[PDB]
Amino acid sequence: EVVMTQSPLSLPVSLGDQASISCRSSQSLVHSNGNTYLHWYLQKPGQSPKLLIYKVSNRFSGVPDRFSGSGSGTDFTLKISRVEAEDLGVYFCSQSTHVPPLTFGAGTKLELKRADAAPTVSIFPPSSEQLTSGGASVVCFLNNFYPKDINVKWKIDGSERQNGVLNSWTDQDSKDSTYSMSSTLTLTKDEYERHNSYTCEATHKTSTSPIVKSFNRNEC
């Protein structure tokens, strides 16, 4: 069972820049026969994986010379001399020296850099239609922000709430390179009618203080 560790998990770059992805194995990948079966694959959204480099440094047929691989033993590196738009996606390293099973690293997402952007936060109360069914979802959108790291906190009558929260994140926007997130706090109609103040708090590098959006139920 060879564990493969890739660093970093996310690599923001500007088109034209050089990029380097690292991969480390829990054991040396040098086989008894002298070969090192370490490979690099790329998988784009909605597509199947594509082989880029095999046995550490052999570029597969058809792959651009901008891709090169190096390393030995337990540490390897995939380099892209000049990043192009078509190179954006997830890069996976994989070992087939100790098999079975053949194993893969968790992947590294090559993404685009852009100027920082604070999220535009909007909060929404449960709809009258949902309440009629006995449910009450409070929704919060945290839109068009950068970088992608962000934290969301829900508060009911001023106290932190953790149960019932479900989050969803979009992939980087192809037009403006920002990220967006949707957070939904689902309660029963009973619980919703039991409290009045509902708050969505966002913590993002663009602010020393959490960004806050809130509303009171008895007002609507």
Binding site: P49, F104, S122, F124, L166, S168, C220
Partner: protein
Amino acid sequence: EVKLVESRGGLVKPGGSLQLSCAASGFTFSGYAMSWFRLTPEKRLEWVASIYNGFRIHYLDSVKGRFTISSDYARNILYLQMSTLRSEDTAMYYCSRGDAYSRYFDVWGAGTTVTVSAAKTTAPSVYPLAPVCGDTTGSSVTLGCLVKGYFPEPVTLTWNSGSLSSGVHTFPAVLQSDLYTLSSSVTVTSSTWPSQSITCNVAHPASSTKVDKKIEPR
């Protein structure tokens, strides 16, 4: 071209069974390591099984005794018989051709989805998300749509039948009580709504349902 034509996937209840297959096109299986891989919901790539010239067989431990890989070298068709299916087996499966000598996989079939669940076909409930009291007088206003409790994936969501495309963010579905929930927001100039109508259109093929929800004030 050289390729692998993948079979259609399927929906299966836990404990059930299903068979996948891939046909070679432009090449022959002999000499290659034919294998099955899968991309889990968490987005992790996993090797599942391999077979070489019909006499060398390997399996990921978690599928031994449940999955069976076989090959018809005459017709050049790879199979994956999945039995005693579990929720954890839900994923996008790929068949692939690998070099026996260098141990890499260069030819991959298109992904085939296998969903293991006890859920029954369910139409989604589409809820309008109207701005709270006080957030309707800025330069722009954001409206939303909550699509809750449907199965199976996917649904098609548009705003104003598709004419409203900019400033829209539709989020990936998440599981909630074994059913899917998705949301979408649209941001427009403050003077646009509600003088001009904004409608969330949700289509769910599986249930032949089309729901249009107008977003209205208060």
